[PDB]
Amino acid sequence: DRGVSTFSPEGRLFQVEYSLEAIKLGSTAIGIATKEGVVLGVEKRATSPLLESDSIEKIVEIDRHIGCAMSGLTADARSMIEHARTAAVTHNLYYDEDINVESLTQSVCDLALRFGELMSRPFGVALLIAGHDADDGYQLFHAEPSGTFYRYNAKAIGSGSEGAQAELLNEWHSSLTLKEAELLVLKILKQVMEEKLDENNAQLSCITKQDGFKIYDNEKTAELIKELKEKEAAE
Amino acid sequence: MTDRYSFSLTTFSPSGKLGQIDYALTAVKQGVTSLGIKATNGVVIATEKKSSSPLAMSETLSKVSLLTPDIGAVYSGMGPDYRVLVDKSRKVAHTSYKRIYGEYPPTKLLVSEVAKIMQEATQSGGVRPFGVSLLIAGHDEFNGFSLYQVDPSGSYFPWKATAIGKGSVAAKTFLEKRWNDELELEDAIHIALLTLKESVEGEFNGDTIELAIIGDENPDLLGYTGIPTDKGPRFRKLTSQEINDRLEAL
Amino acid sequence: NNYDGDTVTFSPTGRLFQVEYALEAIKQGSVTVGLRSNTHAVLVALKRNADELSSYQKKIIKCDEHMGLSLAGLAPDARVLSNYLRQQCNYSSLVFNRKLAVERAGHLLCDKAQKNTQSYGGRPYGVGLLIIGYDKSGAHLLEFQPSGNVTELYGTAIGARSQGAKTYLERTLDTFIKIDGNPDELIKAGVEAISQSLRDESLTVDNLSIAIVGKDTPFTIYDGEAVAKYI
Amino acid sequence: TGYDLSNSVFSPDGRNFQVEYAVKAVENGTTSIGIKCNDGVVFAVEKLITSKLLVPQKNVKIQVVDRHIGCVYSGLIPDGRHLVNRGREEAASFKKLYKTPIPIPAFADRLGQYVQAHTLYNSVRPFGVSTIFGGVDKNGAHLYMLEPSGSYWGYKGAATGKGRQSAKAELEKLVDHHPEGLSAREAVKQAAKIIYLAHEDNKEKDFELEISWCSLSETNGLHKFVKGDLLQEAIDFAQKEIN
Amino acid sequence: MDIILGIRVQDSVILASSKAVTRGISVLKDSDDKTRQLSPHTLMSFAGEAGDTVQFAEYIQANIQLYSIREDYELSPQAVSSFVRQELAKSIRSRRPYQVNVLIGGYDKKKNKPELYQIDYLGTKVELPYGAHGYSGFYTFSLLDHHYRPDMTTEEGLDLLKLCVQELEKRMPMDFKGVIVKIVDKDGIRQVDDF
Amino acid sequence: GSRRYDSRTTIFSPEGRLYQVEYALESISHAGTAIGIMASDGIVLAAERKVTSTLLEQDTSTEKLYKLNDKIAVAVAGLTADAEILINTARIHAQNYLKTYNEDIPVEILVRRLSDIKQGYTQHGGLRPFGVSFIYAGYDDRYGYQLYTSNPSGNYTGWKAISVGANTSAAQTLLQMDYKDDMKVDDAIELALKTLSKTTDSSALTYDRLEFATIRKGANDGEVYQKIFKPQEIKDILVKTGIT
Amino acid sequence: GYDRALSIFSPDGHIFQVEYALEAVKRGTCAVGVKGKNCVVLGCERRSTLKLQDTRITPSKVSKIDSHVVLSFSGLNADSRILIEKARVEAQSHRLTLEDPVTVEYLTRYVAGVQQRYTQSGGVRPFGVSTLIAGFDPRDDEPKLYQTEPSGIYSSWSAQTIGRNSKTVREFLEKNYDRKEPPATVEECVKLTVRSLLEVVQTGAKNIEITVVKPDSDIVALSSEEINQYVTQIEQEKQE
Amino acid sequence: GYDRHITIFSPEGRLYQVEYAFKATNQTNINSLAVRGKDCTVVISQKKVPDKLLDPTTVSYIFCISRTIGMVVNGPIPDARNAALRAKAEAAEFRYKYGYDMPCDVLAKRMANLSQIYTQRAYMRPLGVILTFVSVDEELGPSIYKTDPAGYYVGYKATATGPKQQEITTNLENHFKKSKIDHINEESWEKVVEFAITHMIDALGTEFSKNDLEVGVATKDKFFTLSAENIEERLVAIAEQ
Amino acid sequence: QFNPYGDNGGTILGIAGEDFAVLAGDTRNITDYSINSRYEPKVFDCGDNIVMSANGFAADGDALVKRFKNSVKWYHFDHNDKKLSINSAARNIQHLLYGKRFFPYYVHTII
Numbered sequence A: 001d002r003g004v005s006t007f008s009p010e011g012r013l014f015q016v017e018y019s020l021e022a023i024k025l026g027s028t029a030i031g032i033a034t035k036e037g038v039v040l041g042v043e044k045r046a047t048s049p050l051l052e053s054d055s056i057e058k059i060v061e062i063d064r065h066i067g068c069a070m071s072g073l074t075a076d077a078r079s080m081i082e083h084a085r086t087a088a089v090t091h092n093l094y095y096d097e098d099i100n101v102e103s104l105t106q107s108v109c110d111l112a113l114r115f116g117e118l119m120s121r122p123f124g125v126a127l128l129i130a131g132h133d134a135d136d137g138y139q140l141f142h143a144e145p146s147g148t149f150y151r152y153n154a155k156a157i158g159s160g161s162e163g164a165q166a167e168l169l170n171e172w173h174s175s176l177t178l179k180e181a182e183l184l185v186l187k188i189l190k191q192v193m194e195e196k197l198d199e200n201n202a203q204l205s206c207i208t209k210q211d212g213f214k215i216y217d218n219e220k221t222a223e224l225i226k227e228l229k230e231k232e233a234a235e
Numbered sequence B: 001m002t003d004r005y006s007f008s009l010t011t012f013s014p015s016g017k018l019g020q021i022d023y024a025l026t027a028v029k030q031g032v033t034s035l036g037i038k039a040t041n042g043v044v045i046a047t048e049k050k051s052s053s054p055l056a057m058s059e060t061l062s063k064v065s066l067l068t069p070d071i072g073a074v075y076s077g078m079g080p081d082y083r084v085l086v087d088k089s090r091k092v093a094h095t096s097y098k099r100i101y102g103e104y105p106p107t108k109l110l111v112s113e114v115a116k117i118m119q120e121a122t123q124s125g126g127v128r129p130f131g132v133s134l135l136i137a138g139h140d141e142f143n144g145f146s147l148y149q150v151d152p153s154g155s156y157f158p159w160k161a162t163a164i165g166k167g168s169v170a171a172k173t174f175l176e177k178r179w180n181d182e183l184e185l186e187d188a189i190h191i192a193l194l195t196l197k198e199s200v201e202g203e204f205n206g207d208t209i210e211l212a213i214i215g216d217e218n219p220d221l222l223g224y225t226g227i228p229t230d231k232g233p234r235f236r237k238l239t240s241q242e243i244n245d246r247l248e249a250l
Numbered sequence C: 001n002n003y004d005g006d007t008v009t010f011s012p013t014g015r016l017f018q019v020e021y022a023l024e025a026i027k028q029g030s031v032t033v034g035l036r037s038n039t040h041a042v043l044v045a046l047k048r049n050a051d052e053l054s055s056y057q058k059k060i061i062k063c064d065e066h067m068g069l070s071l072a073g074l075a076p077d078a079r080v081l082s083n084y085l086r087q088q089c090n091y092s093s094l095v096f097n098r099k100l101a102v103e104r105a106g107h108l109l110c111d112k113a114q115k116n117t118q119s120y121g122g123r124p125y126g127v128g129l130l131i132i133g134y135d136k137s138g139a140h141l142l143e144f145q146p147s148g149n150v151t152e153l154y155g156t157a158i159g160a161r162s163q164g165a166k167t168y169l170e171r172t173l174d175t176f177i178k179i180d181g182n183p184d185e186l187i188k189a190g191v192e193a194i195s196q197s198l199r200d201e202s203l204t205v206d207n208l209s210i211a212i213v214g215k216d217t218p219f220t221i222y223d224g225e226a227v228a229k230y231i
Numbered sequence D: 001t002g003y004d005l006s007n008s009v010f011s012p013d014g015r016n017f018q019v020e021y022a023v024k025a026v027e028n029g030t031t032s033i034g035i036k037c038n039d040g041v042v043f044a045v046e047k048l049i050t051s052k053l054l055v056p057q058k059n060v061k062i063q064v065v066d067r068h069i070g071c072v073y074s075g076l077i078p079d080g081r082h083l084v085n086r087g088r089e090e091a092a093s094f095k096k097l098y099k100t101p102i103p104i105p106a107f108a109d110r111l112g113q114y115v116q117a118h119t120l121y122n123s124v125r126p127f128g129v130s131t132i133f134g135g136v137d138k139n140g141a142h143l144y145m146l147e148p149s150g151s152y153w154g155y156k157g158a159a160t161g162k163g164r165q166s167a168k169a170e171l172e173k174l175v176d177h178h179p180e181g182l183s184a185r186e187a188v189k190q191a192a193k194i195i196y197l198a199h200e201d202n203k204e205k206d207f208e209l210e211i212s213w214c215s216l217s218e219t220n221g222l223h224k225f226v227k228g229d230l231l232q233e234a235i236d237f238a239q240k241e242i243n
Numbered sequence E: 001m002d003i004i005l006g007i008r009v010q011d012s013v014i015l016a017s018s019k020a021v022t023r024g025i026s027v028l029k030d031s032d033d034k035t036r037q038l039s040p041h042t043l044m045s046f047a048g049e050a051g052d053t054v055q056f057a058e059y060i061q062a063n064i065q066l067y068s069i070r071e072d073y074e075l076s077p078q079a080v081s082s083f084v085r086q087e088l089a090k091s092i093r094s095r096r097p098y099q100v101n102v103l104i105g106g107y108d109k110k111k112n113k114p115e116l117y118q119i120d121y122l123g124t125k126v127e128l129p130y131g132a133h134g135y136s137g138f139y140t141f142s143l144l145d146h147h148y149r150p151d152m153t154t155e156e157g158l159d160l161l162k163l164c165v166q167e168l169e170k171r172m173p174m175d176f177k178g179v180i181v182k183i184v185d186k187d188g189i190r191q192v193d194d195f
Numbered sequence F: 001g002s003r004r005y006d007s008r009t010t011i012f013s014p015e016g017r018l019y020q021v022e023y024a025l026e027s028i029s030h031a032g033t034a035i036g037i038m039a040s041d042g043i044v045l046a047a048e049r050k051v052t053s054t055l056l057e058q059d060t061s062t063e064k065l066y067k068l069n070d071k072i073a074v075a076v077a078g079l080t081a082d083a084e085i086l087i088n089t090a091r092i093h094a095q096n097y098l099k100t101y102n103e104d105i106p107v108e109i110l111v112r113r114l115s116d117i118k119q120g121y122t123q124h125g126g127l128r129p130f131g132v133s134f135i136y137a138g139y140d141d142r143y144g145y146q147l148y149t150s151n152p153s154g155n156y157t158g159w160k161a162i163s164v165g166a167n168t169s170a171a172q173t174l175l176q177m178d179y180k181d182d183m184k185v186d187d188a189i190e191l192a193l194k195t196l197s198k199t200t201d202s203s204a205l206t207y208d209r210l211e212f213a214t215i216r217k218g219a220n221d222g223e224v225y226q227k228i229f230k231p232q233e234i235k236d237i238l239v240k241t242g243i244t
Numbered sequence G: 001g002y003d004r005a006l007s008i009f010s011p012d013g014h015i016f017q018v019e020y021a022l023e024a025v026k027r028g029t030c031a032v033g034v035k036g037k038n039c040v041v042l043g044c045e046r047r048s049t050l051k052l053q054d055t056r057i058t059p060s061k062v063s064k065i066d067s068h069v070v071l072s073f074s075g076l077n078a079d080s081r082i083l084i085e086k087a088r089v090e091a092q093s094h095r096l097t098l099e100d101p102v103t104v105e106y107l108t109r110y111v112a113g114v115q116q117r118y119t120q121s122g123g124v125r126p127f128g129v130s131t132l133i134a135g136f137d138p139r140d141d142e143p144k145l146y147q148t149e150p151s152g153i154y155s156s157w158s159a160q161t162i163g164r165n166s167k168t169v170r171e172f173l174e175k176n177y178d179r180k181e182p183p184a185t186v187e188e189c190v191k192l193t194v195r196s197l198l199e200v201v202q203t204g205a206k207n208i209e210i211t212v213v214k215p216d217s218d219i220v221a222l223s224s225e226e227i228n229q230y231v232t233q234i235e236q237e238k239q240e
Numbered sequence H: 001g002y003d004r005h006i007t008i009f010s011p012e013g014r015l016y017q018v019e020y021a022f023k024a025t026n027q028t029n030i031n032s033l034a035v036r037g038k039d040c041t042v043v044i045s046q047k048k049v050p051d052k053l054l055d056p057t058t059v060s061y062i063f064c065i066s067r068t069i070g071m072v073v074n075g076p077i078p079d080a081r082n083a084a085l086r087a088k089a090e091a092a093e094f095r096y097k098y099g100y101d102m103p104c105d106v107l108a109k110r111m112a113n114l115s116q117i118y119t120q121r122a123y124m125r126p127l128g129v130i131l132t133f134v135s136v137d138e139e140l141g142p143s144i145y146k147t148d149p150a151g152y153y154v155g156y157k158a159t160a161t162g163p164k165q166q167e168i169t170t171n172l173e174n175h176f177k178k179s180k181i182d183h184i185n186e187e188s189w190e191k192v193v194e195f196a197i198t199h200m201i202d203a204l205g206t207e208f209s210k211n212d213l214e215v216g217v218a219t220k221d222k223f224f225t226l227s228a229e230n231i232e233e234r235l236v237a238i239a240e241q
Numbered sequence I: 001q002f003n004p005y006g007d008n009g010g011t012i013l014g015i016a017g018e019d020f021a022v023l024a025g026d027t028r029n030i031t032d033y034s035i036n037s038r039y040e041p042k043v044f045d046c047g048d049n050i051v052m053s054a055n056g057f058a059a060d061g062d063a064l065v066k067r068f069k070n071s072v073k074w075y076h077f078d079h080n081d082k083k084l085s086i087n088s089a090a091r092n093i094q095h096l097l098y099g100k101r102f103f104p105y106y107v108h109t110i111i
């Protein structure tokens, strides 16, 4: 056939480029970083009404100060999360401190290109890693299967990403509040989702310095959805 | 480096054929004719010494080989494959039997070990099957005299008499008419020489024919005296002269 | 064509296509410039962003107090190679109490990249590196290609549109080599060099990345408002 | 067909096309030569100046093995370095066990067997270099040349790279006109000339000359680079001959 | 640990095991249960070096429970005892052997018979009508040699066991803080809460 | 490199089938028919040797029926050499179990173990599967008389009566027609031979083209006896049932 | 060792070996899982192409992983044994180290993790198996029902079906299963499970297997006659 | 058609890679000849130095494997030297392990077995060489044993290898048909070398100078190669009668 | 028998002030009753405003300090030139020491 670690004539790794196509088929995940915190939101996308939607876990805690959202082949993310959690805890053991969000992200991205003929293929999932540390404050990273990670003020990944990213382009400014960010994630998720957005098929989360990483209750998100509907009807 | 061929080179085709085994059998078909006949008091194995050049000393090339003092082997197909199989067969007779039980293995079990080695070349990674069919004649105390065929697949069958290689189809028909359950060893040798003459084109004498027997114990070939229970090897390779003597009464 | 399936296969004209495709990844990468005098060596790198919300990908990596590089191509491959250099610089210090020579650092990178071009299963590195350093024989600048070829130069540039900066340095050769004991002027020449490779976009405060090493100057990276002085 | 897609595969001719394709990479490289003299050897190489930005005399191509052997090669430069690294390991282990520095014929086979090993499997690529090497041992001077196939012979003169035909013709004249032999200092001068003459095949870009030598009288049987006045003297002699 | 006794009567196996855990100079606990249920009709008591005892017992327990689930079937006491013996016989030639002695009391539901097996840390197995490990047997076997009849009832077995424990409490130097008694019969395993 | 020549023996087709397993089953469909019939008082194993010769030494020959232990036996259909590899492994497993628990191995546990080995060759290793299908005839004190079959996929199932090898479709229909639950060994012997006699590709069914075995509690009191039939004994049972 | 990457991405971002493993599941016999208010029922199809089978000894479709959790499946039978064995070993290992039996979610997460590992490991193909894992957490009376598939994704279901014609029985369950009021009793839950299989099965004879799992390790498999009574009652109500 | 790339069977039962290795054998275009005397075994081989830049002393296809065993090779020099180094190692190991000098026929068998392995194992290619081993064995006397890429080997009364082997083979065959003995009935090795050269001249139809030949001689307890001057003396004797 | 340990003597002293800290140590190095050196530095500046001394067997002391200085260097590389706090350095040193739990660095370390 052909090598798994083969370069294309354009200078790209075939397998890495193909895994990016799998991520485009995944459910939407959006992250927005503010000076009051970082918000992470996801589309759950249940395949059937009999599937209990609260069992869909696409937002995940890595440590008290670091959260993570996923999009693509979500089964591939489990070992990445396990590594991230281990790295975060191990560093605390070695250094009696929290680990930097960037350093955590770098540790996850080191796994990415460890494939060949090590694992047999790249990961088929992209991650939004959001957190806080004392040095660089509130941060949001986009970890890809290429081993590359970009920091973002705001980022959308998954099937509705380019439409959502264009929307984030206009809406984001450096003075956003946490409440404004929450509504903004809900607004853009509602735009790109196939089904009508509610508290059962969409999930919010945030990371603040005080309270740490928190996944929002369905009751709490339902209120923010109702607050969104009214403010859009307000003009 | 490293052997990176850890996958099978012999695989099932859509029709259920194992191609490499079939092709190995085709190589055996091209090989020179060899045969085996079982008598009441012995077994005979024989083949033609197809000399590649008249400058070559064909005595140095042994197609019939001693495996144990009571077991011998002959082949048809690829000579080099046969040679390494004889080496492994001789060694496995010691490692997997004699060093455990203090005696040489019975014919059927040594055959089983050889068969196993050939089967493994049919399934293991990065190897082709052996391109030979063996005929193994031997004797042991509890089974008596026996004659086995071993194919590239690793399958083995016991025979009263048989032939393999070039003119096997004709030779087996010739043996069916002549064989009976009352043959003495000398009668089997006579039939062996008759059968082998049909497949041979050129010279037919003691120097172009290789023939060995599994018969009576040979205390003269033991090399030592002083142990009554040790009576000598039953395997014996017939000399060029001994063959020619029987070609006059042919 | 039929001979580009893996790195272990020469073409009929004696070419290694997988290596050439790896070389292509560098050309797609953002421009970076390297140049030196007799006292100092300077790296200038144009950082690339994904979009307006994203950060600008870092291009320069420190290897030791007296050595470091800038990258163009696959950033993870630069991380692997820079990590290797860090270890080799560190082995030299711990074992021999000796700062690793820039020339010997180049030889080590060449040999590491080479093994990936002759063996089955692996792949060539998809990144080009510009190594600067100050050792016992003064200032140095190296250009690393993932084919294995390493070259000591007065100045150079790699990445997209790097030919413009390389021509400028080829003209300015006699001028910038003489900029001794003046770091700011050597950086100016490097900033002016990388400007010859720009189209549409210009050098902004979070776009530009500069590094310097010299006689009494540890390898230090300048980003953000620290490079506004040179814009 | 398909016999040329994998290393270590015999074509119906009995040829290994992958090794023959490696030769094409060698033929594409710069010119390098070797001259066997009275009590030693002289190595010289053409270094193409791709740009003015190349620092003169810095990108050294000729490599020393042990302290008595010089190695130069044409083709893929990294492949040559890999081969020399192995040569250095081979020489070190020889000296470790046997005390004496590795003889040149002994060293030649070590490289030969290693290069030949890379024509035995499809999991490795052949070397994209022809290596000219040699030096002085207890039995005197020796010059060798080693091809991608692992083939090597002893030589009076050797040449490889893009200007090998030109160089070979020049080497053949020296062999004919000097049956009694050539001195070490003469060989350095002649080496400079031959590289300058062989540069006509690479005449687009200008080049830098690099010479080294081992000689029993001139260098005490140790490998040394030709530097300064002796190098300039050879360059002047070379420039005089082309005009 | 210290004293573990076993006695096989007509229709059941009775295991008695001391409650004391002493490390050095102090008695850290006086209610320790030195036994594990391997299967519904098989019980194993144990005594030996600290840590190893529980580690070994729970390891055996896990293995038998795994077998039970896989085959949906309870192994015979004889089969369980043979598995345990092999583990100890493997263990004695290890880098660091399990220093554990066990009694296995089981009721074979197929044969409708109680069975008592005594196995020491070397992997020395014997089926017995009554058994003990350590210094317990030195006092108790003379009483059992005298009083044991194989047709004894469970109540008679308990009375004979009380006579053993009374002798031990009289003549042994160590205070083993009484025993926990457990009965293994056709209905399974139960603990005698007053002894 | 080596990838070029890799057949990839352990992959799914687009339809979700394992190529090599399917082709191995095709191989087995040309092998001599083997039949197993379970009765209330024993089990019968009957099998047809493939186009034999008059010069084959039958009394010392074994290509179909093999003994795994004193309680369990197997009938083979496929590559004999492949089967002997697995048979020796099975014999060892039974002995391991006996050494560990001091009890004879339950039939299903042995069958599961061999079937798991076969499965492994279809999922990992890159090797070809064993071109063998077994009929397991055995007895233990839990389930009594049992018949199982396993094939190259590593899937196994229990049976009252079953055939493997050639003409299984025809054979299975004939067994399904005449089999009854209250059947006895002597009746099962007759059914097995009658089925082979009808499904055989040969002109006539004779003693020299058959291997035959029975597992009976027809052993003196509560115990089980295996009987691998001799050539003369197969000849007698052929006359008794009225086939020759 | 054999290191060949069998599960790899294609230009359209698909892993065909994982997708072809799902086709093996599509071929497998139908399996269904329905959870009531205080129970979970696992229904399984037995294809009647195989008669003369010995149903005493033939591997049953529903397997106990522990005394409180069960696992059924659709797809390759041989592959399922490997997952079941690993799951059973992990269940005992969890009890040994945590001193508490596995939660149904944990056991599912393990089995799903094994399945995922086989989709990006060299030299191995994915499992051609989807599982339904059901039971009750220790000291908990809330019913649990999870599904896994070759890719390694898993999720919780009020009711779910897998295997051949699962599209049809999922259609049935989606209109007949009410979340606000699930089958309040064992009878109602079994009835709904048998009804759902009767949409696909053929004959309601020995083609339907039912296993009821209740809290506190109360697991029982219904017999032919018990199931046949459900089959009888369903069709007699249908004749109207 | 990958059955032609690696050593697996073609439908005809053939190994094409082995057959193509036999064709590589004649790539050097050199002919070799071996004959046995009473006390000696002589091997001669054509020497061709086409380049004037070559050091002719280093151009050789005859190898001193052990003190007693000599080996001439027909095929490319890299594979020739590969085989030579291995045979030297095997001969030395044999003496260490078993306490006596490795016989010529045993070494031939060992190298033949190694060659057989390359025909069966896929990752190893055959060597494109034919190895002719010569010695005066302490048991068997003058010995010629030849190995090829198929793993085949056999003893010889005399033998020839190369492009024009058939012409040499028939010439030798005809001589032994006359003499009716298995060797050259001659006391001194010098005259056996003269016989070898004379019959190669007759068979090939070409004259030889001292630099056109390469000669190896095996006597009891040593094998040695002749210098150009030793060969010249041999050529002078041939011409003078 | 070979004794891999030795005693190089010396004495060190650390005192924490309100906004400062001192780490002192004598400069004498000895074996048995002989002086090796009258001035052999024992207290080292390890960067990031941390001072360290590993007193006892000097070979193990020098080895430990060398490895910690190395850890500071790699901490900068791996975590974006972040300053290694004294509490984090302390925990890092615990792992360096306990890493050789069964063949210890024979030193009394103070930072």
Ligand SMILES: [Cl-]
Pocket: H109, H110, H113, H114
């Ligand atoms: Cl050998």
